[PDB]
Amino acid sequence: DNRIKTVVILGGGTAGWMTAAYLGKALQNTVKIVVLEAPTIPRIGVGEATVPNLQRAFFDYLGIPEEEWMRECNASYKMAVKFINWRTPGEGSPDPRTLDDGHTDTFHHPFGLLPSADQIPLSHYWAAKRLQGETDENFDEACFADTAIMNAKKAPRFLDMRRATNYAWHFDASKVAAFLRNFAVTKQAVEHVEDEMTEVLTDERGFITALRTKSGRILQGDLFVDCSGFRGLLINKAMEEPFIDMSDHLLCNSAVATAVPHDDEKNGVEPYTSSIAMEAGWTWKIPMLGRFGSGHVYSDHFATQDEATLAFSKLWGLDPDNTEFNHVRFRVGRNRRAWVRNCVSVGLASCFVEPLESSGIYFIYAAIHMLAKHFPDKTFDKVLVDRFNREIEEMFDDTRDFLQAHYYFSPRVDTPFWRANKELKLADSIKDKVETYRAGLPVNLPVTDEGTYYGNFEAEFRNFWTNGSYYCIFAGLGLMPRNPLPALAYKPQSIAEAELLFADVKRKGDTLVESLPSTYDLLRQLHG
Ligand SMILES: [K+]
């Protein structure tokens, strides 16, 4: 028996309890699991957004129904990230300004794969018509019916819970973590030790043999998972793995957040996350029932905590001296290696980017999934560790580049922050993709249908940011192809077939906007 016998997870929150619950299922009762988590001082719940695979890849794996967990964390529905004021100058405002060309400064990044005609995505037929003046429609409204549903604030399900569209979730992270702790302790026999870590004990090879807690108790184990957050108490301190700072790619390094009571009856509930451009970063808005989480992400090189706090307060008309605020300084980048010896980092201890595309929980689920597949024995085969590390670094570096593109192709030059973004270097892989896009070609064409894509985690993981996503961001920000895809000039029958697809998107939008309940009414039914 060369097998791991005990796994010790350092830290709770979403990373620790997701790791514990998932390995609890994956390891089929053959391994003892211990979580060491300090008792937490409650923070105001500032909200978290997600991607659509979360229910199939995580909660369904555990046998937890959607309704059951949503009801315990005041969850709500997300059909997109909506970008506001990313092309126009001025102070932070929740209200979209007007472009020079008359359009409102808003664009959406929704979920779902674009349809095709003649093996060409609908994106390309839209681009051809827009470049030739045959349409004035934006990409998002021409190509996704979700745009019209979100503009009317309708829900992504009917009141009988029939599905109408793709969606993800908004929720209180600290409640999801509590829900998962309860699940893991009562249904999977995870041991919860409520204490702080004071020592990390190592053998002659530098492998961890145990942690000591503040009370003096020693927790022995074979494999250690670092979910300790930005401090990286195992991976960075004890194992001495360097963190690669990537502030030469992304500038924001701080946030100030709160939760804002909201009149759902008067205003309705928006089925989407908003990203509101500010003078020295951007502000998230994550609606739940009765409230929204909000947070201004900023670079402390271009604004002081007080400046940021004032600009954030002015957005929502908060009184800055009579408001509860959380302040965070973050690490941007990743570890040189995520897994060293018998220490595997997951969550913030591993890697982090600002939540501009709701990547946080995804990075956790992906790391845990890959750990279960690369799960070691006590010989810790180096190839197994290497392959895991290689997946984590490519996943992170890919999303990092995608995020950088949101900033680099903003036309804003009104503040030193917006201008500073354009003096950073683009990474090679994203320069290559921009060039491809600019010639009218697709970037990262989806391999498969939407069922298979959101059904099989490996299919999404290998094609996470597809053609549709690059169009949403580049076209949204005003970067167009230099010309249409030249093949389209030879394909009049394919042009006409795409016209039918555009008409289908319009019909679906008009029909569903008439018949769907409001997001508010679906939430009221769900939360009982
Ligand atoms: K051991």
Side-chain angles (χ1 to χ4, degrees), residues 131-179:
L131 286 170
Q132 287 159 187
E134 296 172 287
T135 191
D136 284 278
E137 290 183 288
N138 296 314
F139 168 65
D140 60 0
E141 68 186 318
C143 293
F144 304 91
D146 312 62
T147 304
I149 297 172
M150 281 186 286
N151 285 343
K153 302 186 188 166
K154 297 307 209 192
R157 298 189 175 277
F158 293 94
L159 286 182
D160 59 12
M161 301 304 290
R162 266 143 61 234
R163 176 176 300 269
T165 69
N166 284 294
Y167 66 93
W169 302 265
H170 301 146
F171 54 68
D172 188 326
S174 79
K175 295 214 222 283
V176 164
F179 172 86

Side-chain angles (χ1 to χ4, degrees), residues 208-209 221-222 378:
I208 302 163
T209 60
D222 308 317
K378 278 166 140 148

Side-chain angles (χ1 to χ4, degrees), residues 356-376:
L356 188 51
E357 287 282 1
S358 312
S359 79
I361 289 185
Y362 170 70
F363 283 171
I364 290 164
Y365 173 73
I368 287 163
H369 184 99
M370 283 304 155
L371 174 57
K373 169 178 176 189
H374 296 74
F375 206 79

